Design a protein around this motif. Structure first.
Motif, PDB file in Angstrom:
ATOM      1  N   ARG A 178       1.890   0.664  18.419  1.00 34.88           N
ATOM      2  CA  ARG A 178       1.285  -0.572  17.923  1.00 34.88           C
ATOM      3  C   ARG A 178       2.307  -1.603  17.431  1.00 34.88           C
ATOM      4  O   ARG A 178       2.161  -2.785  17.800  1.00 34.88           O
ATOM      5  N   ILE A 221       1.668  -7.441  28.278  1.00 33.16           N
ATOM      6  CA  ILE A 221       0.892  -6.487  27.494  1.00 33.16           C
ATOM      7  C   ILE A 221      -0.464  -6.201  28.130  1.00 33.16           C
ATOM      8  O   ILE A 221      -1.056  -5.155  27.839  1.00 33.16           O
ATOM      9  N   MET A 223      -5.961  -6.411  20.237  1.00 34.35           N
ATOM     10  CA  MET A 223      -4.695  -6.859  20.807  1.00 34.35           C
ATOM     11  C   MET A 223      -4.878  -7.375  22.227  1.00 34.35           C
ATOM     12  O   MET A 223      -4.226  -8.349  22.628  1.00 34.35           O
ATOM     13  N   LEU A 224      -5.773  -6.750  23.001  1.00 29.77           N
ATOM     14  CA  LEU A 224      -6.090  -7.286  24.318  1.00 29.77           C
ATOM     15  C   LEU A 224      -6.806  -8.627  24.222  1.00 29.77           C
ATOM     16  O   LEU A 224      -6.600  -9.497  25.073  1.00 29.77           O
ATOM     17  N   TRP A 257      -8.119  -1.578  17.543  1.00 27.84           N
ATOM     18  CA  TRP A 257      -6.827  -2.257  17.527  1.00 27.84           C
ATOM     19  C   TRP A 257      -6.390  -2.636  18.935  1.00 27.84           C
ATOM     20  O   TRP A 257      -5.889  -3.744  19.156  1.00 27.84           O
ATOM     21  N   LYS A 258      -6.562  -1.720  19.891  1.00 26.35           N
ATOM     22  CA  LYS A 258      -6.219  -2.000  21.279  1.00 26.35           C
ATOM     23  C   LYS A 258      -7.110  -3.094  21.859  1.00 26.35           C
ATOM     24  O   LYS A 258      -6.633  -3.963  22.601  1.00 26.35           O
ATOM     25  N   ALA A 303      -4.146 -11.130  23.530  1.00 28.62           N
ATOM     26  CA  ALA A 303      -3.391 -11.432  24.742  1.00 28.62           C
ATOM     27  C   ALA A 303      -4.184 -12.343  25.671  1.00 28.62           C
ATOM     28  O   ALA A 303      -3.647 -13.317  26.210  1.00 28.62           O
ATOM     29  N   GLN A 304      -5.466 -12.033  25.878  1.00 32.14           N
ATOM     30  CA  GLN A 304      -6.299 -12.826  26.773  1.00 32.14           C
ATOM     31  C   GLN A 304      -6.650 -14.194  26.200  1.00 32.14           C
ATOM     32  O   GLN A 304      -6.959 -15.111  26.967  1.00 32.14           O
ATOM     33  N   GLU A 355      -6.617   1.305  10.518  1.00 31.35           N
ATOM     34  CA  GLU A 355      -7.149   0.673  11.721  1.00 31.35           C
ATOM     35  C   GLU A 355      -7.254   1.682  12.856  1.00 31.35           C
ATOM     36  O   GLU A 355      -6.271   2.333  13.206  1.00 31.35           O
ATOM     37  N   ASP A 356      -8.456   1.817  13.412  1.00 29.53           N
ATOM     38  CA  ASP A 356      -8.678   2.722  14.530  1.00 29.53           C
ATOM     39  C   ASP A 356      -7.982   2.199  15.778  1.00 29.53           C
ATOM     40  O   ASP A 356      -7.836   0.990  15.970  1.00 29.53           O
ATOM     41  N   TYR A 357      -7.524   3.136  16.617  1.00 29.01           N
ATOM     42  CA  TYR A 357      -6.756   2.783  17.809  1.00 29.01           C
ATOM     43  C   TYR A 357      -7.575   1.991  18.820  1.00 29.01           C
ATOM     44  O   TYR A 357      -7.034   1.097  19.481  1.00 29.01           O
ATOM     45  N   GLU A 358      -8.875   2.271  18.931  1.00 33.44           N
ATOM     46  CA  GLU A 358      -9.684   1.605  19.946  1.00 33.44           C
ATOM     47  C   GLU A 358      -9.931   0.145  19.588  1.00 33.44           C
ATOM     48  O   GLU A 358      -9.754  -0.746  20.427  1.00 33.44           O
TER      49      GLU A 358
END
Lengths: 17, 612, 290, 114, 90
Positions: free
Chosen positions: B323, B333, A10-11, A6-7, A14-15, A1-4
């Motif tokens: 992560r 977060i 995850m955002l 994934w971030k 959260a939203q 999974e690429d970091y971008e």
DNA sequence: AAAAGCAAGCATAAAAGATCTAAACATAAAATCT
DNA sequence: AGATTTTATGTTTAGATCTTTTATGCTTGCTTTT
């Protein structure tokens, strides 16, 4: 999974919480 | 062509004001270069201090031997059975010259094997080294430094006072035998008039000294044997006292640790190559950014957090351990993944968590290694380094070897078991008093560890004052030391990537050199390097027609026997794909330039393969 | 690469891909500057020619630092030439001493006298045609040991580290880098280290009597499928192609110079005169002379 | 009493087998007067035959060959000027008892191949 | 030299021929190979043995003596043990 | 019958042995500084 | 009118060369065991 994507997913988890 | 490519000259000066710190000020003033230079100066000075403290006993014995000859025909001479790692010992002989000059007991020449191809050159470099060494303590041409001039110089200087004339021969194995025997006979001829001492540097054994010195030459030798400590003992001392020290914030991973010790134990016993490889690991770690300049002692780390910009925040977010830290946590977060200042305010807790975890790792290892390595058969190894690699590489409790350690410790009698656990307790307490108390963030580490040791000691008192209690003592040792303070590196506290160095692939590439593997995978499948859309091979022996021209010639070469006629080779290559003959000649010339083939001399128009 | 011993005991798109590869190796350069600053020396071990890559490093990065390029693929360079180049041009110290290790001792002293005067040293093909002896590699390792001197070098031969022992490999503080360009070895193989038409072109320049002497050797070779010298001497004195023996020896010395004739002496002392060309082409040459 | 690296020990016992076993017996022992001359590729072939682990041909292994030559554990009976061209001939110069001691420390039983 | 008709010898051949006597000599049992090697070098530096002009233990050599000189040494020698005097005859 | 083994043969090459020559070293003529 | 590099020159020693001679080795051509 690429970091971008994934971030971004995850955002989105959260939203959507 | 290019102006550098000339038919006449071979070397091309581009002088820019040379008479008779490479980086600019942007890099040197960056914090990561500062922390890298600080950690490297600390590690290098500690390793040099360990090497001097290991050499000091043999140094005092050699200096006492030279002064004892000075208190007083055969020349006195001292074989020094030093190790295979020849370059490392120049610092030893330099320390010997420093001690002999500081005592004013002797003057030292050093005879390298490169300087003494013949007896004339050996005598000239010997006399020139003695005279210029005396001149450097407080320039004749090398054609006129006769031994008679050495005698006249010694009579003009030191006859009124006796300085010894020590002649170090560091590379005894590399000498010509006849030059060395003639030099020993020359120095033995001048004994009485000139006080000579002949220390040597024998990398192998004394049988080489008894072999290269004949009956006549050994008639004039009164040698004494000194022994330098073994190279693996020096490696173990450096690895335990430096790379596992609590006071350094930079740690290797278990893979990098095992890789550097594998290079030492399986290839070369040079300590210097291991030090340069650790320096490359330190540089590859610290040159990733100012986020890795946070990897330091705690106060300067807090100053680095208050210094930080935004690319450092991005590269502390991108690292893999963050992560799980995020998914194991909503507004918090959002403030972590966007607000930046909240992450700046939350960094000190994570840094204190990581530094405290590595301090507890070293203390729990100093506990566990005695209790495990005292055992017969040693499932986890004897010294601290093997248990370091084992506890970092994988979770320790799930390993079969920990089950074997628990079984073989369960089979003990009560007296040796209680003595073993009490020895582990006394050793851990001595380590907590000696090495963790001076260190910053060591008071909190002692406050975490010490009640657990008191609970294990109370379990020891419970098994002393009362069979099945030994299993409860093993359970207390497991779940207050092995389980909590000895986690696997994947289970380390988050943003531990700032402190460990786990990137073994690029460093193994840049340290271990394998030209043949690169030439092999470039001459077999060019698609690995070129990444063409057409040149991929489903298997390496296919020989497709779109390949680069060296590969087709190399494969038609590889698929046959030793002696190769050029003509049927040309017909096969012409069948695969005028200018084609010039392309075949260019490919055969390049393949000869790499050393894969060579032209035959006895038989024209043929080639022999040098590879197998 | 883990070779099996049984082989011894039984004995377009390409331009854009190469340009992307060269742009990546050009992107590596600041890391090489930091690595050279830390005391490591750079070694490249790719497949193709790395001349243009090290020239780009000298051009784009070392545009103002002192630089001694050394072409190791040169057939005729000597280590005395390189030490003389450093000693005379970098330091203005005159000619280096004739012992090369004395020259390295002198270079170490003079470079100890001048901190922050770094000398970059680029050696294309450290495994060069005249650098394959152990002594030149010992000189290069002693030069790379110096803190002032930094070294970049190329490697091409498969058997190169057979001459680097652990002392040289410790003095050469190498940082190996796989710079596998796919460029052809033009310049490295352009130098000297790696026929009936020529016989006609040299036969045209000869005089009439030399043509008769070579035609006598050609007729004897085609008749016998190397002639003794006495038969050629008697045939030339009968045909009046020579005045005495010494002029015939001068003509055969000219033929040995122009490689038309190989002279193979016999155990009896007679000189044999082979023509080193197959007899079908020799028969065609005799038909050409008619 | 000569401590050695592990791959240097295997290289040294392989050079002893190359100088002690003659050229013809390698085909029967490894496909699975004085000490003999041996070329470096014969040494690498016997080393890969006795290794049973197959490490790669890095710089460090051929560097171990050259530094065993420099310690007078091996020798240059010929060649010298052309080590890289394959015309070099080496000659192992140690006794059998040191090889048996190295085979005790390593665990490679040398006497099976003699 | 008498058996092989003045062929060149070696330290290994001469040490083997000496040890075949030394195993039954009942006075020469105690010598090390290194002492015999240093004795061979002591023979070599007196030029009683000359090289044919390779390890020092395997270099080929030539005797520099006629057999009559060794035979007169056998009679002129002082305190020669009888075992060596019997071994010299055969 | 298959592939390892002994005389044969020219050939790069290796010693060598004289021999000639190029560069390093010692040295003298001389402008230069005092 | 005297000291100092400076330069031009001669000698000497290490290296290139010519030549013979000798040898291991590269290849060949049978040769012979498995």
């Amino acid at each position: 999974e690429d970091y971008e994507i994934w971030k971004a997913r995850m955002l989105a988890k959260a939203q959507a919480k | 062509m290019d102006p550098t490519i000339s038919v006449s000259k071979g070397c091309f000066v581009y002088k820019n004001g040379a008479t008779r710190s490479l980086l600019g000020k942007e890099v040197v003033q960056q914090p990561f270069y500062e922390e890298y230079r600080k950690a490297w100066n600390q590690i290098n000075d500690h390793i040099a201090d360990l090497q001097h403290r290991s050499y000091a006993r043999t140094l005092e014995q050699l200096v006492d031997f030279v002064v004892g000859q000075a208190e007083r025909e055969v020349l006195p001479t001292a074989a020094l059975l030093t190790g295979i790692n020849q370059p490392d010992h120049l610092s030893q002989f330099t320390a010997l010259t420093q001690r002999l000059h500081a005592q004013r007991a002797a003057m030292v020449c050093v005879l390298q094997s490169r300087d003494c191809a013949t007896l004339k050159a050996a005598v000239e470099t010997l006399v020139f080294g003695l005279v210029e060494d005396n001149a450097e303590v407080e320039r004749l041409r090398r054609s006129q430094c006769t031994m008679k001039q050495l005698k006249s110089w010694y009579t003009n200087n030191f006859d009124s006072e006796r300085r010894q004339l020590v002649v170090i021969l560091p590379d005894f194995e590399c000498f010509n035998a006849s030059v060395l025997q003639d030099l020993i006979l020359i120095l033995s001829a001048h004994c009485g008039s000139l006080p000579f001492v002949l220390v040597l540097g024998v990398a192998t054994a004394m049988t080489a000294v008894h072999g290269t010195l004949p009956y006549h030459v050994s008639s004039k030798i009164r040698l004494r044997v000194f022994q330098t400590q073994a190279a693996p003992t020096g490696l173990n001392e450096v690895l335990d006292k430096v790379l596992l020290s609590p006071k350094y914030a930079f740690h290797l991973s278990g893979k990098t640790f095992k890789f550097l010790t594998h290079i030492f134990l399986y290839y070369d016993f040079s300590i210097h190559g291991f030090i340069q490889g650790f320096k490359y690991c330190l540089m590859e770690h610290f040159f990733g950014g100012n986020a890795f300049a946070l990897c330091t002692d705690y106060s300067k780390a807090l100053g680095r957090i208050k210094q930080l910009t935004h690319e450092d925040m991005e590269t502390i977010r991108r690292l893999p351990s963050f992560r799980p830290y995020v998914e194991q946590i909503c507004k918090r977060i959002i403030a972590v993944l966007t607000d930046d200042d909240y992450l700046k305010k939350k960094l000190p807790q994570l840094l204190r968590d990581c530094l405290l975890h590595f301090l507890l790792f070293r203390c729990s290892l100093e506990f566990l290694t005695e209790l495990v390595g005292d055992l017969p058969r040693c499932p986890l190894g004897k010294l601290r380094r093997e248990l370091y690699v084992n506890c970092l590489n994988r979770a320790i409790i799930s390993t079969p070897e920990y089950k074997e350690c628990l079984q073989m410790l369960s089979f003990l009698s009560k007296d040796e078991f209680v003595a073993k656990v009490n020895r582990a307790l006394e050793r851990t307490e001595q380590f907590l008093v000696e090495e963790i108390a001076p260190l910053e963030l060591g008071e909190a580490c002692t406050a975490v560890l010490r009640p657990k040791l008191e609970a294990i000691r109370l379990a020891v008192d419970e098994v002393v004052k009362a069979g099945r209690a030994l299993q409860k003592t093993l359970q207390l040792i497991e779940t207050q030391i092995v389980q909590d303070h000895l986690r696997a590196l994947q289970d380390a506290p988050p943003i531990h990537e700032l402190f460990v160095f786990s990137d073994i692939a690029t460093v193994r590439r840049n340290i271990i050199g394998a030209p043949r593997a690169a030439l092999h995978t470039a001459l077999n499948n060019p698609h690995f390097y070129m990444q063409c859309k057409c040149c991929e091979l489903q298997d390496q022996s296919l020989l497709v027609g779109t390949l680069p021209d060296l590969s087709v010639v190399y494969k038609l070469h590889l698929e046959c026997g030793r002696m190769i006629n050029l003509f049927d080779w040309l017909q096969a290559f012409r069948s695969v794909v005028p200018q084609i003959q010039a392309r075949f000649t260019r490919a055969v010339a390049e393949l000869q330039f790499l050393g894969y083939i060579k032209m035959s001399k006895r038989k024209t128009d043929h080639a022999t393969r040098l590879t197998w | 690469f883990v070779p099996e011993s049984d082989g011894y005991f039984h004995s377009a798109e390409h331009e854009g891909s190469i340009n992307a590869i060269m742009e990546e190796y050009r992107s590596y350069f600041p890391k090489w500057m930091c690595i050279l600053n830390e005391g490591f020396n750079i070694l490249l071990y790719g497949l193709g020619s790395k001349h243009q890559l090290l020239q780009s490093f000298h051009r784009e990065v070392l545009h103002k630092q002192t630089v001694l390029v050394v072409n190791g693929f040169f057939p005729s360079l000597t280590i005395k030439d390189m030490l003389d180049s450093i000693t005379s041009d970098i330091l203005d110290a005159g000619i280096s001493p004739a012992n090369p290790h004395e020259a390295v001792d002198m270079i170490e002293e003079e470079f100890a006298l001048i901190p922050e005067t770094h000398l970059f040293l680029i050696v294309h093909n450290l495994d060069g045609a005249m650098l394959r002896n152990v002594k030149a590699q010992a000189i290069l390792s002693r030069l790379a040991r110096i803190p002032n001197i930094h070294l970049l070098a190329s490697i091409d031969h498969i058997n190169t580290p057979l001459l680097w022992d652990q002392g040289k490999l410790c003095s050469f503080n190498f940082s190996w880098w796989d710079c596998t360009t796919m460029l052809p070895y033009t310049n490295e193989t352009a130098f000297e280290n790696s026929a009936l038409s020529s016989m006609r072109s040299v036969f045209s320049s000869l005089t009439t009597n030399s043509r008769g002497i070579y035609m006598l050797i050609v007729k004897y070779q085609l008749k016998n499928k190397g002639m003794p010298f006495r038969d050629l001497y008697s045939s030339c004195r009968e045909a009046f192609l020579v005045s005495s023996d010494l002029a015939l020896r001068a003509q055969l010395t000219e033929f040995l110079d122009h490689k038309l004739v190989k002279s193979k002496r016999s155990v009896d002392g007679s000189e044999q005169l082979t023509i080193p060309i197959d007899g079908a082409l020799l028969q065609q040459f005799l038909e050409e002379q008619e | 009493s000569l401590e050695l690296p592990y791959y240097a020990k295997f290289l040294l016992i392989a050079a002893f087998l190359a100088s002690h076993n003659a050229a013809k017996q390698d085909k029967r022992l490894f496909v699975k007067l004085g000490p003999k001359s041996f070329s470096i590729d014969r040494l690498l072939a016997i080393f890969y035959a006795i290794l049973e682990e197959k490490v790669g041909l890095t710089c460090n292994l051929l560097s171990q060959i050259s530094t065993l030559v420099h310690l007078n554990l091996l020798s240059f009976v010929s060649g010298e000027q052309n080590i890289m061209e394959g015309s070099a001939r080496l000659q192992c110069t140690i006794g059998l008892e040191f090889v048996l001691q190295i085979g005790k420390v390593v665990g490679f039983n040398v006497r099976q191949y003699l | 030299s008498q058996i092989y008709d003045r062929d060149s010898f070696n330290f290994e051949i001469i040490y083997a021929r000496f040890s075949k006597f030394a195993k039954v000599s009942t006075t020469m049992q105690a010598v090390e190979r290194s002492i015999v090697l240093k004795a061979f070098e002591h023979l070599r530096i007196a030029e009683l043995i000359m090289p044919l002009t390779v390890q020092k233990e395997f270099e080929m050599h030539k005797l520099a003596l006629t057999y009559s000189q060794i035979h007169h040494c056998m009679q002129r020698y002082q305190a020669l043990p009888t075992e060596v005097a019997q071994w010299a005859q055969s």
